[PDB]
């Protein structure tokens, strides 16, 4: 709770911020990890083993 | 040994006992009338148990001489078609007696006596196998219903409605009686089993069929003659409307099933497009006129014309799905429609009004009524799991096999049927309250809760397992499908 001009904004609890940051970080890491594995495949640079 | 004699004599004893009882003993009159009705209902239920479902021959046949040469005589018998009609017409009477339980002090003994004479006359209608005596008990119902409409009407309009109903019934009745007389003179007798084995010249089939249609179409209002039903129905007591819609509307269809669809197989085929045309527009017109009605009892009364005209599509399809599925609709309609008029009767007894404008927000003051009213709203709009859907769908599959166009037009009936059925419920039950108009409320009492219970049980029991009713009719409705056919 911080008041600038009358209005106050209740600071969120630690549990919410930690969970949101963790889920976002998991999403980003998963996207990059998938881009490492089959990123060239969707780009068309290399087939899995077709050719 | 339970036969048709005792079932018919029970209302006779019930009406005679109350005939010679002092009117000051109001309690005894009600108890004896209710006991007689319940005993008759149990007698009918027992008659169901011992009903053979493998023979097309009429069962529990009884004979009583009428003319000295046995030309015409009292032949009583039931089959798979008229058994459930007898059960329904014996089951509806105790409910009608229980409706006027609180206010019975003003009606007197002439109320229960009239209803018991009604039950006596309607039981014999569904049991008669003689063409002439079927007409005698066919038009004997007018006097008790005339008395019920006139003596215990709501407003001064009761004189007009009774006159109109009586005149229409008479004009149908005598034009049918001329045909019955012509059949008697030519054939020689009036026994149904003999009239079903006599070849009629093709020229005489059309005239006799038209004459029979004149009387039956009035009691199953097709298109030109559904103007007596709304007025006579609205100007009727709460129990009076149950009889008019529950049973009195089932004479026309039963008359078609018993004396028209078989005695003239060739005439029925020729007039099949005519019946399809009248029934298709009746479903479209009536289900549409229902939207612009403002009276609570004049909306449900218009929900019966669409449903009953959907039945005549099923009967004239002439197949097991059609004819067999049309019977379930009338049993379902006899329970769903008669339960809706109980719901309206509940609202009218407390608040002496019927306009939908005065009603609204009852969901917050009468919750048990709202739950019960909603359930019968679902049944009236052909929901699966209800007895109406089984009959409604079986008729559609019975008419699609004969004509795809008539099954398409009749399918819009459930489109419009689901429109006003829920839209009425939204107005009456849902919404905000109007304390300016009406402010005192009372939910369903012990009688109303108990009265609706057999309707609730008998509507889902037929809706989830209709095999109990269906298997008792297939032997009797299959012999009805083909009579002149031999291949």
């Amino acid at each position: 709770g911080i008041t600038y001009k009358g209005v106050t904004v209740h600071t969120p609890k630690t549990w919410h911020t930690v969970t949101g940051k963790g889920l976002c970080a998991v999403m980003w890491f998963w996207i990059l990890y998938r881009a490492k594995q089959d990123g060239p495949v969707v780009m068309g640079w290399r087939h899995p083993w077709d050719g | 040994y339970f036969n048709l004699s005792g079932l018919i004599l029970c209302p006779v004893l019930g009406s005679i006992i109350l005939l010679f009882i002092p009117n000051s003993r109001i309690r005894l009159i009600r108890l004896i009338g209710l006991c007689a009705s319940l005993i008759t209902f149990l007698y009918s239920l027992v008659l169901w148990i011992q009903f053979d479902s493998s023979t097309a021959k009429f069962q529990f046949v009884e004979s009583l001489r009428w003319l000295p040469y046995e030309n015409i005589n009292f032949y009583l018998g039931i089959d798979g078609i008229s058994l459930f009609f007898v059960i329904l017409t014996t089951f509806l009477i105790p409910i009608c007696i229980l409706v006027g339980w609180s206010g019975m002090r003003s009606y007197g003994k002439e109320y229960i006596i009239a209803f018991l004479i009604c039950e006596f006359l309607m039981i014999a209608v569904f049991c008669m196998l003689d063409l002439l005596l079927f007409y005698v008990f066919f038009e004997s119902v007018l006097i008790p219903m005339f008395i019920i409409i006139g003596v215990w009407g709501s407003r001064q309009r009761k004189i007009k409605a009774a006159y109109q109903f009586f005149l229409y019934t008479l004009l149908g009745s005598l034009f049918m009686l001329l045909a019955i007389l012509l059949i008697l003179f030519q054939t020689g007798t009036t026994d149904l089993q003999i009239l079903l084995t006599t070849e009629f010249s093709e020229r005489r089939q059309i005239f006799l069929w038209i004459a029979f249609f004149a009387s039956f179409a009035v009691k199953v209002p097709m298109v030109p003659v559904h103007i007596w039903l709304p007025e006579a129905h609205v100007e009727a007591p709460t129990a009076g409307s149950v009889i008019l819609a529950g049973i009195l509307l089932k004479f026309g269809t039963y008359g078609f099933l018993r004396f028209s669809i078989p005695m003239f197989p060739e005439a029925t085929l020729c007039f099949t497009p005519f019946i399809y045309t009248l029934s298709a527009i009746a479903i479209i017109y009536t289900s549409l006129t229902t939207l612009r009605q403002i009276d609570l009892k004049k909306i449900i009364a218009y929900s019966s014309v669409a449903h009953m005209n959907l039945v005549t599509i099923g009967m004239f399809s002439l197949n097991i799905q059609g004819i067999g599925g049309s019977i379930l609709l009338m049993l379902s309609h006899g329970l769903v429609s008669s339960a809706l008029f109980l719901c309206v009767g509940v609202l009218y007894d407390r608040h002496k009004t019927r306009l939908v404008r005065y009603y609204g927000g009852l969901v917050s003051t009468m919750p048990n009524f709202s739950t019960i009213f909603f359930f019968f709203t679902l049944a009236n709009m052909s929901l699966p799991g209800t007895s109406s859907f089984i009959g409604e769908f079986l008729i559609l599959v019975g008419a699609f096999q004969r004509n795809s166009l008539v099954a398409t037009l009749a399918a819009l009936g459930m489109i419009l049927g689901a429109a006003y059925s829920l839209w009425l419920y939204n107005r009456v039950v849902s919404g905000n309250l109007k304390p300016d108009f009406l402010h005192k409320f009372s939910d369903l009492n012990g009688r109303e809760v108990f009265i609706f219970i057999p309707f609730l049980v008998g509507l889902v029991w037929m809706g989830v397992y209709p095999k109990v009713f269906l298997d008792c009719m297939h032997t009797s409705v299959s012999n009805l499908v083909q009579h002149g056919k031999f291949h």
Binding site: - | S364, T365, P367, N368, T371, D443
Partner: protein
């Protein structure tokens, strides 16, 4: 309001909170459990599995109609 406390409804009304809803809740579970037993026993009897499972499945503990309809030529 003041009058909605005088209206009986099956659902319970607005902001319904009985003094002994904990005990009633425990009873309702036990009633649901008792009525679910015959349904489970009925289901294990009328169920048919034409195909043997790839791996041992838990339904083989109670169900016994496994690989029974393989002779479909003699079905009724």
């Amino acid at each position: 309001g003041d009058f909605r406390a005088k209206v009986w409804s099956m659902t319970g009304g607005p902001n319904c909170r009985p003094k002994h809803w904990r005990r009633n809740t425990a009873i309702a579970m036990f009633g649901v459990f008792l009525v679910c037993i015959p349904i489970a026993k009925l289901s294990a009897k009328l169920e048919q599995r034409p195909h043997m499972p790839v791996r041992p499945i838990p339904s083989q503990i109670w169900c016994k109609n496994f690989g029974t309809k393989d002779d479909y030529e003699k079905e009724h």
